[PDB]
Amino acid sequence: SQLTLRALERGDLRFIHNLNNNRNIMSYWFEEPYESFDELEELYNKHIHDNAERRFVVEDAQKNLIGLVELIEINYIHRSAEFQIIIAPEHQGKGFARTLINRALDYSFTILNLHKIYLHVAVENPKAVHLYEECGFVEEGHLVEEGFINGRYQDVKRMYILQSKYLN
Amino acid sequence: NSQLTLRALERGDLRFIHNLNNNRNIMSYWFEEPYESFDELEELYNKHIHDNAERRFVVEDAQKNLIGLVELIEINYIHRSAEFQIIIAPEHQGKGFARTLINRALDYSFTILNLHKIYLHVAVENPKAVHLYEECGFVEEGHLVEEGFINGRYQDVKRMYILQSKYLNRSE
Amino acid sequence: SQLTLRALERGDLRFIHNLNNNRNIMSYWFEEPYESFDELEELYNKHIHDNAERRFVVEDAQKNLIGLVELIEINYIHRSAEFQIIIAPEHQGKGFARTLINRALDYSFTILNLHKIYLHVAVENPKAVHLYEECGFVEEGHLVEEGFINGRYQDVKRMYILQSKYLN
Amino acid sequence: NSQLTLRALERGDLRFIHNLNNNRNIMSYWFEEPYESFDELEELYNKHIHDNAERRFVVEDAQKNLIGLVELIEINYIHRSAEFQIIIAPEHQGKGFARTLINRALDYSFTILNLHKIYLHVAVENPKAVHLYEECGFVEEGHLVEEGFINGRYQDVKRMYILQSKYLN
Amino acid sequence: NSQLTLRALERGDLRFIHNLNNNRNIMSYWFEEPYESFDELEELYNKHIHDNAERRFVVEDAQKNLIGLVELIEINYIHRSAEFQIIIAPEHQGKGFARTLINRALDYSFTILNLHKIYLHVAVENPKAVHLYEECGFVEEGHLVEEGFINGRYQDVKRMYILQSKYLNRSE
Amino acid sequence: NSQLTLRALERGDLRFIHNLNNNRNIMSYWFEEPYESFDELEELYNKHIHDNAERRFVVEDAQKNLIGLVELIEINYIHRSAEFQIIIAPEHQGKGFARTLINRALDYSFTILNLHKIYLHVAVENPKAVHLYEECGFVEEGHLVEEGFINGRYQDVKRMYILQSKYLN
Amino acid sequence: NSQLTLRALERGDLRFIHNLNNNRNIMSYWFEEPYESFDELEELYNKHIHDNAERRFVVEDAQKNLIGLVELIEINYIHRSAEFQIIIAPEHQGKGFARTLINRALDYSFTILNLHKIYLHVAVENPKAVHLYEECGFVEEGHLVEEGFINGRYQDVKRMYILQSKYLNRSE
Amino acid sequence: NSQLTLRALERGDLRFIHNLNNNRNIMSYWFEEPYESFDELEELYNKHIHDNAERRFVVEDAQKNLIGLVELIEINYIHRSAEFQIIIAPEHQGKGFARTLINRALDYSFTILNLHKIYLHVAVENPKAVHLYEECGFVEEGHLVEEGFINGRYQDVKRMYILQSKYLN
Amino acid sequence: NSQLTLRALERGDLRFIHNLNNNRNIMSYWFEEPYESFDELEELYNKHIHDNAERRFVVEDAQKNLIGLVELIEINYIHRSAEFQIIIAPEHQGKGFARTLINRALDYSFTILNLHKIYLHVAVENPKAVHLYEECGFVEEGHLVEEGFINGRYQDVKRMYILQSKYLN
Amino acid sequence: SQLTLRALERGDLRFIHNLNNNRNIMSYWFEEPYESFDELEELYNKHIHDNAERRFVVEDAQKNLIGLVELIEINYIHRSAEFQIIIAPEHQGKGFARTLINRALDYSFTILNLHKIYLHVAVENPKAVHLYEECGFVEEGHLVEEGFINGRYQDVKRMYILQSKYLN
Amino acid sequence: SQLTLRALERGDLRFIHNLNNNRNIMSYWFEEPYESFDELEELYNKHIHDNAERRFVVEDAQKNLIGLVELIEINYIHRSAEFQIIIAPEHQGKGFARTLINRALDYSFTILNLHKIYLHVAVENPKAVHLYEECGFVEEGHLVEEGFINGRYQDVKRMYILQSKYLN
Amino acid sequence: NSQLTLRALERGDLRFIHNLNNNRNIMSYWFEEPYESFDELEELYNKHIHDNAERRFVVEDAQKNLIGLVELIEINYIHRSAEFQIIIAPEHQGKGFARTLINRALDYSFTILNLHKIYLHVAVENPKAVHLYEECGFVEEGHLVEEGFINGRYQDVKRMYILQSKYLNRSE
């Protein structure tokens, strides 16, 4: 409850770079690949005004960085966006996920007025699917060999939630 | 209240602007383009530094403490109109500084810019503000239904106006 | 029924300039004033990709220019836009207005997925208010001295229609 | 004289403009920048094509024959004023169309742009022009001495005005 | 059908593209930016002429008559994926040219671009097309609900895929 | 009053400029472009730093305390004219230094720039200022009616002039 | 001679300029930058089209035949001075058109530009021209020695002037 | 040797890069463009900072002491190949960390970028290096004769490869 | 076959280029950048028109009928090497003109550009081409395995070379 | 003799601005007018590479700024330039002029290989004409009303010296 | 005598390209290599105003293109330039060389006021050395392996002529 | 002498370059453009930072004291030639460091750049330097008369060369 969401600032880019460490996956910023901190800050400067992606830094009461809440591929004609939450390893198993997931859905459905929010989860991480399922998400796709994760193509589940059910 | 002073907004005041837009829980715009980050605001401020379609004024006291903001937007010099929005910091919201800021704004709009009409928008679910402006000389000219999506619901908003004729004269 | 809507092209700018003649009002293109044809084509080139305004040219079966249907101040967050229809003097009193008004509402509510469409009518043209009223629009504002039309400030009615009623 | 039509200046009309400024014996300006050749004007027309400080109208007749030019310069939208200048081609100078052009100019200034004041400048050594504008509603508000260097001499110039209040009422 | 030929789209073919997007009654995009005018399309074509994230191919016959369009979008060369969309002109829609165009597209994607997966989207209210792709080797991997707003209603769309493994092998 | 020194305006003095334009209750312009914030002025100062249409001088004293500003706008080098404006800080408004600043301004206009005429504008509702310039050599050449919208009213303004011939002789 | 007319130089007249600089056997300049090719001239003309430091005037007759050129260079509006150069085509060099062109030039310089002084340079080895200008009111103010390298030798050049005072008055 | 960590190259590490290229006696390239001074490299690093044709990783230890560099050049994402080069600082050349760096490089090439082939070039006059890569999984696919001008002589160079299939299985 | 003439590539010949790359079933590059449409090539030809890393020659006959293309890519002037590729139109593939084009290419490489080495790449599944270049002076220096993805298969490619020393002597 | 010539640097621009004070004449930098220090530094940056004018700062042994030696309107085809020397008021009457004038002629005739060096002197300052005359310059022109100096047009003498006589 | 020199124009670039054919040497335009006509015209446009090289087209009475006279590496401080004359194969052995060489020296020494004009001749073409020698040029250098001409480094003679001797 | 080290010139060394060009009393060039001020040099250095037609190398000792400069100019990679110029600070001119710098330069030119010929220019009125280079393997190939204007007089300059063949071999 004490956790707060804050729009992403330049200073928070170091926290983004640290979150990427230990993930072992190509990081993208507005659909452009980056791996070093200097590559990131340059693209943050060039996409500063692009409203197709919005990122919020999650902090506690004493302002310790907990994680990141990012909405990508925002389309205002169809009113959809892809949701992705990244919790720092320090606070991964402390139960902050469900609160941050509700905070993200709140901003998406009560400020941006989006119709649908979908996410992508690895089939090889079933407990994460149960998490999002218990948060209101339902499976709508089982993408076969969608991503190349550590030397092999993996299946990824696409799950959605509509504005209708979150508000009612 | 008479110790308050209006000052054209500077770059050093953008921090004060950012802290105002939070807790409002509404999309913040700068020259009709959205923003929610301090850096995003600063870049827009430098890009529209010379754009005269909008003007914003910081209000401070003798202590130089920041009390609120006055902004004119959608300024058109052929029809001589502009939209009016007032925002006072939460710390000074209840000490009745608003009426002074409103009068200072109308005095600038109608005696320096030589505008003909000033309109504003207020939420129908905030009768306190609608009543405040009616006290300051604003008349309702529209009840726009489901014009804004606020807090997960389409709500109505009142549009109220005041003419240069009433402000400058009336007492005459 | 034979009337067709077509996105605005460069060649149609001459028809726009001719429509402005005999109106006696400042013409705007993406909120910028113009009065000569050369001023118009230059701004058409600079705002070619701005999706805040969409204009459709109305033609008949034999492709005679009937009028223009323009949506301005399109906001995809709140899903609103201002509607304006301009019929050429040759075909003004032939009854093409109601058909073109329905065509405009169709594009706005079934392709762009807008929530509200408002228009502005002069109080001194009451029969036009009755037209839009019989088309589904309802008055939501009586703006006092909103526009300067031929040497005097005039009152203008703002009328709206919601996507909910047009679809049902 | 009700046949004459005002039309916003187009790039093609810059030839008509150039021919009118010849025979005048005066430095011609386009948005406060001097020019003399047709090419200099065409380039400056492209640079200031969307500048709202000045506005120029070409006046034609029923046959579309060019009659004259009406230009409003130094347009300030805060004070709501502008300077007015009318130039008729030598072909039609004596046909008595000036008054109609002056009123069609004032009609656009006061009924569409919503300006409060329109002032103009006339040489003191042209009293017929002073009387002309006087009969159109303009009043002398200044006698600027040695304001301009015309024909090798510093000459005095009358500044004349008319307000939106009088023209509308 | 074997007389059809695939040709990289040129500027002279943009007219053929514009005439295709009309009567579809759907927002048309070019490198993920909307357009509905021929001039708007032409300007976008010149701006993304060198962008390799998308490729479009015109298909013509021995008569050099334009039959349809094949386009790859959302191409990513790290995951080696792309989205597939086929559009045949209304005059040739029913003569069974589609299967040839689909195979020509997959042959280009899997033997020249060396892609791993090709996916496409089809409306659930168009079982004819869903069946056509299932015949060509596509398998359903998703039933996205209310993903698209078509003709005044939020509709579901099927996402179907095919892997380079099946296309190149299977017969092996 | 012979201690006062004129110095070309520097970027650092833009603070002094901004503070003077406060308290005036008037729209301030920098090269015919409006501004209100210190940042707006600093940007426009950088854009027009080499524009010769206007020239501004900061006047200091022996202690280098800033006294006032002397600006010449609408400088035309073909007609050899310019508009003059003097603004003294409220701290020294009543010390009677105006006349010396006016003459130091005219001295730069007529002895270095080689201008023929210098005109200025004074509000009719400030007769003390009209008399001041009258005693400095300026003569009224116009009574512009409702020229400016000041303090919520269209007010009349006097236009006053002095020629290079008189000042030098 | 009274049928001659002065016209501001246009792009279509640059061909006439190029043909003039040949046979002169002297470095040709355009806004103080050298050129000897038609294309080199045209590019310089477009680059200095708006530069008011120099002005050139083509002179033509009732037949619209090109007779010569009049150019002002080194124009300075603070000192109100300019350099004067006249060039008549070889076909019309001997019919006494020069005096009219010189007077037309001084009339433009002293009645429109409101200049104070006009100076020119003439070769000491051309007493015909020095005498022509002395007839037109020019007085020698300098005998610059070895100022120019002409035809393989450093030669002297006369600098002659005329003031606005003499031209406008004198008759008075 | 499990303490060594790979980190994407940062602008600050360009000093470490410059010091490594000294002592090599070879023309150094940054995105197929030659350079010699620290300033030339810093400018070209800014120009190609978002170019995906090359990728360079700085390898540190637990103490964050810089150990070496791993760079992948000529990265083609259609053929899924790249050229590999490993450079260890003279301080740690004999500590036997090379093999771990080579495998950490191949792990990023084949497990994240999804490349099919990685080739490298070794001088024939350095058989110890050829054997090293041979024991890491690389096989000779070419003996390029007089490929490079090294130390004043056109020398032969071995081209060695390893496929994603072998490394993963 | 002495009638064939080499001519530097002109913008007009880009049609001939585009038609040759059709029928090849391979991704075509222009200065290491992929393209497929005639418009994409014309734009990239304008961007790299003064780049000296590649050089392409159109070969015609006495009738000026286009015969083929000779392109030298990856030209490095420090190591003095380049990659060679010859493409003959299907119309004249069997007329036996290849050898003359190969030698005319090597003559420009070794007698004008002063290059030391020229290498080329040939598919292993085209032994007739390998023999052809072998009889022209090229020697195999590498058997690159699974170097290219051709016709849906990773195939091996021979790299062949010839030095300036042999060709001149 | 201890006096040294040094190419003009950015830091020396303040000394240039101070030299202009008490001159009461329009200052030009590469034929462009300036009056404030900020105007000067901007034009110094834009004309940094223009070789049509070369300026040298004159200093003593202890590096006190004595004056300026500037060559303007340098033409390498005809090999000519205009010379101008400006001594600070502190050291005006100490006899540094003749030495600095010889230093300027040395650089012009032995490094740039110029054929002619001319200067402009006021007729109303005859002792300055005698100075340059005794330095080798000879009058070649008496320009009438050439410059506007303090409210009146003044005559200016143009005097020259050829490379031939300085070297022999 | 009837031969005329004319500054190089855009249209003459085709003649330049044809002259290069049958030379078998890398062609340079302002020290930049070119081989196709399109490469040449682009560099002609970019170096249109560079006065370090001047080229004149030689024509007859009937305006048939005879050859080219180009001065390169023009230095106005030292007053030197490199001369190069190229006669078309059609008129090579008709004796136009000596006339064109004198025309070039005339322009260099009587209009540009250059002090020295040097040229480069192949040692393996001795009759060309005798030509320039009989025109006033004298050998000042025998450069060893200066140019790579058709598969071998060749020696090149550098010969000069001073303005002093051509004028006297 | 073996403790000397060659280092590519950096921006921090431009001050050392400026102090070298003074007292030489000769026009200083940077990529064939003149300069005589430190700021003029710095701006040219940043503009030609990536130009590979010239390369300059600072030489320093174990003490990191600046000893001199080595520069290659007029580098052409088709003919594989370059011009060589060496400049040692006056404080270290007489301690015989030159021969080491010359050999270091030729070693870089002939073993890294793979150049074929290196030429240099020396004043005929400086037989000390002409003799120094003859000791280092340079042969005179030209006696260019009145090529340079030095100290008010046109002087002759010797052009001397050395080939990659001699440097790399000879001992072989």
The Cα–Cα gap between A123 and A141 comes to 11
E158 has which bridge partners? E122, E143
How many other CB atoms are found less than 10 A from the CB of residue I140?
15
In which region does residue L105 sit, left (phi positive, over 0), alpha (psi from -120 to 50) or beta (all else)?
alpha
DSSP state for residue J108 in the 8-state scheme:
H
Q: Which residue of B has its CA nearest to C141?
A: B142
The Cα–Cα gap between E5 and E70 comes to 11
Q: Which phi and psi angles does K66 have, rounded to 5°?
A: -90, -50
User: Where are the domains positioned within chain B?
Assistant: 1-172
- Give the CA count within 13 Å in the CB-facing half-sphere of E161: 18
| Residue whose C-alpha is closest to residue K120's, from K100, K140, K93, K94 | K140
Query: Is B86 annotated as belonging to a binding site?
Result: yes
The Cα–Cα gap between G1 and A152 comes to 94
Task: Report residue H129 as tokens.
Answer: 């290096």
Write out chain J residues lying below 8 Å of F10, CB-based.
36-38
The Cα–Cα gap between B29 and B21 comes to 10
The Cα–Cα gap between B135 and B92 comes to 20
Structural contact between residues L6 and L102, judged by C-beta atoms closer than 8 angstroms: no
Write out chain I residues lying below 8 Å of L113, CB-based.
78
The Cα–Cα gap between A69 and A76 comes to 19
Work out the angle at residue H76's Cα, subtended by the Cα atoms of residues H71 and H79, and round it to the nearest 5 degrees.
130
The Cα–Cα gap between J129 and J158 comes to 10
Query: Is B51 annotated as belonging to a binding site?
Result: yes
Task: Report residue G153 as tokens.
Answer: 């030798």
What are the DSSP calls for F17-80, one per residue?
HHHHHTTS-S-EESSS-EE-SHHHHHHHHHHTTT-TT-EEEEEE-TT--EEEEEEEEEEETTTT
Do chains C and K meet with 3 or more Cβ pairs nearer than 8 Å?
Answer: no
- Residues of D assigned a catalytic role: 133
How far from chain centre, in Å, is Cα J24?
16
List subunits contacting chain H, requiring 3 or more Cβ pairs under 8 Å.
A, E, I, L
Query: Is H16 annotated as belonging to a binding site?
Result: no
Structural contact between residues I146 and H163, judged by C-beta atoms closer than 8 angstroms: yes
How far from chain centre, in Å, is Cα H138?
14
- Continuous segment of H or E residues that includes residue K34: strand K33-34
Contact J25 F114 (CB under 8 A): no
- Which residue from C7, C49, C109 is facing E152, i.e. has the nearest CB? C109
How many other CB atoms are found less than 10 A from the CB of residue A59?
18
How many other CB atoms are found less than 10 A from the CB of residue J78?
17
State which amino acid sits at residue F112.
I
Task: Report residue D72 as tokens.
Answer: 């409003």
List subunits contacting chain E, requiring 3 or more Cβ pairs under 8 Å.
A, C, H, I
What are the DSSP calls for C39-94, one per residue?
HHHHHHHHTTT-TT-EEEEEE-TT--EEEEEEEEEEETTTTEEEEEEEE-GGGGGG
Contact B77 D79 (CB under 8 A): no
* Three-state secondary-structure class, residue L133: helix
DSSP state for residue F95 in the 8-state scheme:
S
| Residue whose C-alpha is closest to residue B169's, from B113, B118, B110, B82 | B110
- Beta strands, E only, F102-168: 117-123, 139-150, 153-163
List subunits contacting chain K, requiring 3 or more Cβ pairs under 8 Å.
G, I, J, L
- Give the CA count within 13 Å in the CB-facing half-sphere of A158: 21
Q: Measured between alpha carbons, how far apart are the two ends of chain K, in Å?
A: 22
The Cα–Cα gap between A55 and A71 comes to 6
- Which residue from L10, L50, L110 is facing H152, i.e. has the nearest CB? L110
Write out chain A residues lying below 8 Å of E81, CB-based.
146
Q: Which residue of K has its CA nearest to I106?
A: K151
Catalytic annotation present for G133:
yes
For E37-92, what is the HEC assignment?
CHHHHHHHHHHCCCCCCCEEEEEECCCCCEEEEEEEEEEECCCCEEEEEEEECHHH
Output the CA–CA distances (angstroms, integers) from residue B19 to A62, B16, B38, B98, G153, in the order listed: 18, 5, 9, 19, 79
Experimental approach was: X-ray
Task: Report residue C168 as tokens.
Answer: 């049902």
* Three-state secondary-structure class, residue E117: strand
The Cα–Cα gap between C13 and C39 comes to 11
Task: Report residue C100 as tokens.
Answer: 């073109």
How many other CB atoms are found less than 10 A from the CB of residue C29?
21
Closest Cα in chain I, distance from residue K59 (Å): 27
The residue behind tokens 């969307």 is D50
The Cα–Cα gap between D72 and D107 comes to 12
Q: Which residue of C has its CA nearest to B164?
A: C145
- Beta strands, E only, L16-152: 28-29, 34-35, 55-60, 66-76, 81-88, 117-123, 139-150
Closest Cα in chain E, distance from residue A90 (Å): 30
The Cα–Cα gap between I9 and I15 comes to 11
| Residue whose C-alpha is closest to residue G3's, from G65, G58, G62, G57 | G62
Output the CA–CA distances (angstroms, integers) from residue I99 to I67, I132, I162, in the order listed: 13, 8, 14
Contacts of K108 (CB under 8 A, 6+ apart): K71, K81, K83, K114, K117
Work out the angle at residue H28's Cα, subtended by the Cα atoms of residues H25 and H33, and round it to the nearest 5 degrees.
150
Structural contact between residues B62 and B56, judged by C-beta atoms closer than 8 angstroms: no
Output the CA–CA distances (angstroms, integers) from residue C138 to C117, C158, E123, in the order listed: 11, 9, 36
β-pairing verdict for B5-8 and L81-88: unpaired
Output the CA–CA distances (angstroms, integers) from residue I65 to F137, I13, I38, I54, I101, in the order listed: 89, 12, 21, 24, 15
Instruction: Give alpha helix (H) positions in G22-157.
Output: 38-47, 98-111, 127-135
* Three-state secondary-structure class, residue K27: strand
Structural contact between residues B140 and B124, judged by C-beta atoms closer than 8 angstroms: no
Work out the angle at residue D147's Cα, subtended by the Cα atoms of residues D145 and D149, and round it to the nearest 5 degrees.
120
How many other CB atoms are found less than 10 A from the CB of residue A106?
15
* Three-state secondary-structure class, residue J160: strand
What are the DSSP calls for I113-126, one per residue?
S--SEEEEEEETT-
β-pairing verdict for I139-150 and J153-162: unpaired
| Best to test chain A binding among B30, B40, B151 (most A CBs inside 10 Å) | B40
Contacts of F148 (CB under 8 A, 6+ apart): D79, F123, F154, F155, F157
β-pairing verdict for L117-123 and L153-163: antiparallel
Backbone Cα Rg of chain I: 16
The Cα–Cα gap between L169 and I103 comes to 32
Contacts of F107 (CB under 8 A, 6+ apart): none
| Residue whose C-alpha is closest to residue D116's, from D164, D155, D76, D73 | D164
The Cα–Cα gap between A34 and A36 comes to 6
Work out the angle at residue K55's Cα, subtended by the Cα atoms of residues K54 and K60, and round it to the nearest 5 degrees.
145
Write out chain H residues lying below 8 Å of I78, CB-based.
27, 34, 149
Structural contact between residues E51 and E31, judged by C-beta atoms closer than 8 angstroms: yes
Task: Report residue C127 as tokens.
Answer: 């029969």
Contact F40 B8 (CB under 8 A): yes
How many other CB atoms are found less than 10 A from the CB of residue A10?
14
Q: Which residue of L has its CA nearest to H36?
A: L8
DSSP state for residue A71 in the 8-state scheme:
E
DSSP state for residue D122 in the 8-state scheme:
E
Task: Report residue G2 as tokens.
Answer: 């009274």
Task: Give the annotated binding-site residues of D.
Answer: 27, 32, 40, 48-51, 74, 83-88, 93-99, 126-135
Task: Report residue E99 as tokens.
Answer: 């299967």
Q: Measured between alpha carbons, how far apart are the two ends of chain G, in Å?
A: 25
The Cα–Cα gap between E71 and E58 comes to 9
Structural contact between residues J142 and G142, judged by C-beta atoms closer than 8 angstroms: yes
- Which residue from D8, D10, D111 is facing C151, i.e. has the nearest CB? D111
Write out chain J residues lying below 8 Å of G120, CB-based.
none
State which amino acid sits at residue B116.
H
* Three-state secondary-structure class, residue J119: strand
Task: Report residue H55 as tokens.
Answer: 């990728």
Backbone Cα Rg of chain F: 16
Q: H-side interface with I, Cβ within 8 Å?
A: 27, 34, 78-81, 116-117, 119, 141-149, 154, 159, 161, 163
Backbone Cα Rg of chain A: 16
Closest Cα in chain D, distance from residue B74 (Å): 15
Closest Cα in chain J, distance from residue G124 (Å): 13
- Which residue from B49, B110, B168 is facing F39, i.e. has the nearest CB? B49
What is the resolution in angstroms?
2.7
Closest Cα in chain H, distance from residue E39 (Å): 32
Backbone Cα Rg of chain G: 16
Query: Is C146 annotated as belonging to a binding site?
Result: no
Instruction: Give alpha helix (H) positions in B4-67.
Output: 14-21, 38-47
* Three-state secondary-structure class, residue L46: helix
Structural contact between residues A129 and A121, judged by C-beta atoms closer than 8 angstroms: yes
For chain H, what is the HEC assignment?
CCCCEEEECCHHHHHHHHHHHCCCCCCEECCCCEECCHHHHHHHHHHCCCCCCCEEEEEECCCCCEEEEEEEEEEECCCCEEEEEEEECHHHCCCCCHHHHHHHHHHHHHHCCCCCEEEEEEECCCHHHHHHHHHHCCEEEEEEEEEEEECCEEEEEEEEEEEHHHHHC
Contact F78 D34 (CB under 8 A): yes
- Which residue from C77, C140, C143 is facing B145, i.e. has the nearest CB? C140
The Cα–Cα gap between I92 and I131 comes to 19
The Cα–Cα gap between E143 and H61 comes to 49
* Three-state secondary-structure class, residue K32: coil
State which amino acid sits at residue J28.
Y
Contacts of E95 (CB under 8 A, 6+ apart): none
Structural contact between residues K143 and K157, judged by C-beta atoms closer than 8 angstroms: yes
The Cα–Cα gap between A115 and A108 comes to 9
DSSP state for residue I45 in the 8-state scheme:
H
Closest Cα in chain A, distance from residue E86 (Å): 21
Q: How many CB pairs under 8 A join B and F?
A: 29
Q: Which of A28, A44, A107, A132 is catalytic?
A: A132
The residue behind tokens 């000069």 is K160
How many other CB atoms are found less than 10 A from the CB of residue C50?
10
Task: Report residue K59 as tokens.
Answer: 């024509």
The Cα–Cα gap between G35 and K48 comes to 10
Query: Is E16 annotated as belonging to a binding site?
Result: no
How many other CB atoms are found less than 10 A from the CB of residue J166?
17
Work out the angle at residue F117's Cα, subtended by the Cα atoms of residues F113 and F123, and round it to the nearest 5 degrees.
120
Contacts of G71 (CB under 8 A, 6+ apart): G54, G55, G56, G57, G84, G85, G87
Structural contact between residues L109 and L118, judged by C-beta atoms closer than 8 angstroms: yes
List subunits contacting chain I, requiring 3 or more Cβ pairs under 8 Å.
E, H, K, L
Q: Name the packing angle between helices D14-21 and D38-47 (round to 10°).
A: 130
DSSP state for residue F94 in the 8-state scheme:
T
Query: Would you call J90 exposed, middle or buried from its count of C-beta atoms within 10 A (0-12, 13-18, 19+)?
Result: exposed
Task: Report residue F67 as tokens.
Answer: 């006294």
Contacts of A125 (CB under 8 A, 6+ apart): none
Contacts of H136 (CB under 8 A, 6+ apart): H99, H102, H103, H106, H162
The Cα–Cα gap between A41 and A12 comes to 10
The Cα–Cα gap between L60 and L62 comes to 7
Contact B113 D78 (CB under 8 A): yes
Write out chain K residues lying below 8 Å of L161, CB-based.
143-144
Output the CA–CA distances (angstroms, integers) from residue D59 to C67, D46, D86, in the order listed: 27, 21, 10
